[PDB]
Amino acid sequence: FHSFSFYELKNVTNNFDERPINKMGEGGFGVVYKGYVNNTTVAVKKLTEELKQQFDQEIKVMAKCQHENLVELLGFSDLCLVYVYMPNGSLLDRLSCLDGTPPLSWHMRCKIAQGAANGINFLHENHHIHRDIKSANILLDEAFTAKISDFGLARASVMTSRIVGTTAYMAPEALRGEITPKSDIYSFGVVLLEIITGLPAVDEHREPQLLLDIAAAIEDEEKTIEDYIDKKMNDADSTSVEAMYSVASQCLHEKKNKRPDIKKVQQLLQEMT
Ligand SMILES: O=C([N]C1=[C]C2=[C]N([C]C(=O)N3[C][C]N(C(=O)C4=[C][C]=[C][C]=[C]4)[C][C]3)N=C2[C]=[C]1)C1=[C]C([N+2](=O)=O)=[C][C]=[C]1
């Protein structure tokens, strides 16, 4: 950790230039900018007291959660969080091949899914619920090691009146204010479908619009997973694919109690390879 000056961060972000190439992404909770400090390329997240909680929620969890499959926080400071730069961005942007990056091989996809499961496993073992598991919050380092980000809106492992998260990924019970680690499982389910299909979780111009409903159609023998396997790879085999799809289907059980725990997800993803 460390305590950066707002002016230093401002200086290394070209006055937080809200224009891409120093900007690199934007959630609901803030904007992310590229920076250089201590000869280290960094990410700078600039973030009513709700927002100030998400800052300390990020610090509190990042103060007591270091794992190979979680992003690393370097410091803080207009509230600003500083992270180690993830040169290969988000799983979402790499699945979509944004900026012309090569399609991820099935081999790398299988590694990213296990990494992502291990990061969720560490969170759940340390009595944290992420509450916003999605391809955009799985980041990729210099070796394409999966790194879970955005532990804002996380909570100790109940109902809330402020339903938060990303609709296209959220469990039914989470959409009704419930807060259970089994919500993280369902959302990871949607991530596994993104990995298999290369399709976004919501596409306004697509029928169906939600990848969730594609999942349901396949369970009702009206679609097939083979017909949805991402065509932008040459190293997929049916066995590993339909084994990963099996994990996603178990993850996407509408009834929370019938979904596996993150430990069983990890095991099933290992058995796959
Ligand atoms: O670094 C954090 N995030 C982020 C990091 C990010 C890197 N990029 C750029 C990116 O992936 N690029 C990929 C390669 N590119 C090319 O053009 C290319 C290269 C080879 C062949 C063809 C094309 C362009 C650059 N985009 C990013 C967004 C977000 C981060 C964020 C947080 N966070 O709390 O938001 C925490 C920890 C780390």
Author numbering: 165 to 185, 190 to 215, 223 to 252, 257 to 336, 343 to 458
Quote the study's own text.
Upon binding of the respective ligand, TLRs (except TLR3) and receptors of the IL-1 (IL-1R) family signal via IRAK4. In this process, ligand–receptor binding is associated with recruitment of myeloid differentiation primary response 88 (MyD88) protein to the receptor, where it interacts with IRAK4 forming the myddosome. In summary, IRAK4 appears to be indispensable in TLR/IL-1R signaling, and activation of the IRAK4 pathway is associated with inflammatory and autoimmune disorders such as atopic dermatitis, lupus erythematosus, hidradenitis suppurativa, and rheumatoid arthritis.
Our approach to generating an orally active IRAK4 inhibitor started with high throughput screening (HTS) of 3 million compounds in Bayer’s proprietary compound library. A docking pose based on the IRAK4 cocrystal structure led to the hypothesis that the positioning of the nitrophenyl group in direct proximity to the Tyr gatekeeper provides an opportunity to modulate aromatic–aromatic interactions by varying the aromatic system. The proposed binding mode employs the trans-amide as a hinge binder. Generation of a cocrystal structure was first achieved with compound 5.
